[PDB]
């Protein structure tokens, strides 16, 4: 309705584009309500270029006490980049939210595209899925070579550009380790993209990121995760039980190479899980799934994707049911919070 007007205005903006503050960004519809607030499309005043603005609403932040989580995601994504990790362009605040304004990926997210292809077509066709898997792997590999444990990765964080190349994007709750440590304790990341080790409150290495990859890949092809049903997400406690206990069964949608590859990643013990085998993560790269994709051309981005996102249609949801969490009642901001908000902004 009004959302359609906003969507029409987005289409108008895209047309102009194809052809920092409250007086610097045109606002369009929200595309979802994330962990700490809404994430809406927006457009530069002086450039006429489209950006996503991951808003972390101040009210929702205070409620969840999500101040730590915000700073981690910021600093990490800000520092680490490749051609499979998108740039962060601005970090400002308005009056009601902290903003991360990040670089173009107007092609939507992989999760959207699972259902937008058709919902009676589960995931992508096998060559198209294989291509994207190869690209995701390269992005993870780049993190691992820098000795970074991500503890995350999900379909919604794998974005398509308009070329059709995929990139991981938005580096959330993670830790960048130095050379001279690989094992660290903690409970971090979004449940279901966390491996057994984290959930049980034990040390973990690079293995866990490869666990997340397994979950991602499985959802990409089958249109449901190994630990959740089609277009569903279960409660954290149940999800924790699933990750620890639930054996993975494989549809016939998968090719044999992709089945075997998924099995290798989704093992519950790090020792039996493909990834870091104590001398390389290039043992993973030897798997027959990647016989279709040359590594040299892949890493340099010289391979054409078997799908090119159309620019005459606009991807991502338009508000019609998005999540929500409390906004403040009697709850009044601490001095500490105000200092965090300024500090967050660059």
């Amino acid at each position, epitope marked *: 309705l009004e959302t359609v007007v906003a969507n029409s205005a987005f289409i108008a903006a895209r047309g102009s584009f194809d052809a920092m503050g409250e007086d610097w960004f045109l606002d369009f519809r929200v595309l979802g309500r994330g962990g700490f607030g809404e994430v809406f499309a927006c457009q530069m005043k002086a450039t006429g270029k489209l950006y996503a603005c991951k808003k972390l609403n101040k009210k929702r932040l205070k409620k969840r006490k999500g101040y730590q989580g915000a700073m981690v995601e910021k600093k990490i994504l800000a520092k680490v980049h490749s051609r499979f990790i998108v740039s962060l362009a601005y970090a400002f605040e308005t009056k009601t939210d902290l903003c991360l304004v990040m670089t173009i990926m107007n092609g939507g997210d992989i999760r959207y595209h699972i259902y937008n292809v058709d919902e009676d077509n589960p995931g992508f066709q096998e060559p198209r899925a294989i291509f994207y898997t190869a690209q995701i792997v390269s992005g993870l590999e780049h993190l691992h070579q820098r000795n970074i444990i991500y503890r995350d990765l999900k379909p919604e964080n794998v974005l398509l550009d308009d070329d059709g190349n995929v990139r991981i994007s938005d580096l959330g709750l993670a830790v960048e380790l130095k050379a001279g440590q690989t094992k660290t304790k903690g409970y971090a990341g979004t449940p279901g993209f966390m491996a057994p080790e984290l959930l049980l409150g034990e040390e973990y290495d690079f293995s866990v990121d490869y666990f997340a990859l397994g979950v991602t890949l499985y959802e990409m092809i089958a249109a449901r995760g190994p630990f959740r049903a089609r277009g569903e997400k279960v409660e954290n406690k149940e999800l924790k039980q699933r990750v620890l206990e639930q054996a993975v069964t494989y549809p016939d949608k998968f*090719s*044999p*190479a992709s089945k*075997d590859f998924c*099995e*290798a990643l989704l*093992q519950k013990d790090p*020792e*039996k*899980r*493909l990834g870091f*085998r*104590d001398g390389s993560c290039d*043992g*993973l790269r*030897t*798997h*027959p799934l990647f*016989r279709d994709i040359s590594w040299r051309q892949l890493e340099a981005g010289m391979l054409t994707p078997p799908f090119v996102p159309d620019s005459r249609t606009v991807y991502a949801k338009n508000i019609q049911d998005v999540g929500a969490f409390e906004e403040v009642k009697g709850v009044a901001f601490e001095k500490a919070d105000t200092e965090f908000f300024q500090e967050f902004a660059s």
Partner: antibody
Amino acid sequence: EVQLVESGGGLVQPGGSLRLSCAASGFNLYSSSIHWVRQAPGKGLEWVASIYSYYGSTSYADSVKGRFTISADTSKNTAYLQMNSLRAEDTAVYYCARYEGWWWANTYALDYWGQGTLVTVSS
Amino acid sequence: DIQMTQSPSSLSASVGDRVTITCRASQSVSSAVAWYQQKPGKAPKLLIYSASSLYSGVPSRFSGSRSGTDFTLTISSLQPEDFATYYCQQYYEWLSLFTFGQGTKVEIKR
């Protein structure tokens, strides 16, 4: 259970060639890797060759490498070993065996073997 | 190259004994040890797979322990058919052969 019944043995001249067949049952061939292992009489076991589950990658033990060519037909569910160049040490009972996955896949090991088929290299 | 050693080379045992044999790889092939029993008139038969995990349809008399480059196979109680040659295998390649031990002969003490 899974079972392999070999055939195609016999007496064969030195420096000749012979093709062994291993007929597979209890599984779909395209869904399992297949290998050949041989046993010299009253001795250990030497692995000969492997070929991938959905067929595409091959590995060989150095002594038999190139000389013997492992192959399979998933349209017959039968694995073959084409043996070119025969030597005195090649006189052996020949076993096919099965293998699952490839490059870490519940960390397999060689789980089903044939009963062997006798190859006699002699003149 | 991959060199598989076992010890004892041979051992004299009787039925209902605790037999412990070890296997050693010359380089680290990770936790990756199968144990096979071979005895005349039979084809090789899997006992233990993975690293120490008992294979399905195998008696629980056989068990394995340890990790690293030093693997163990323990037979808790012998039966009269456990006088045989026992081989370890490591089942990995880089394109190197799948390597088996030289067999450990459990023989009848007298």
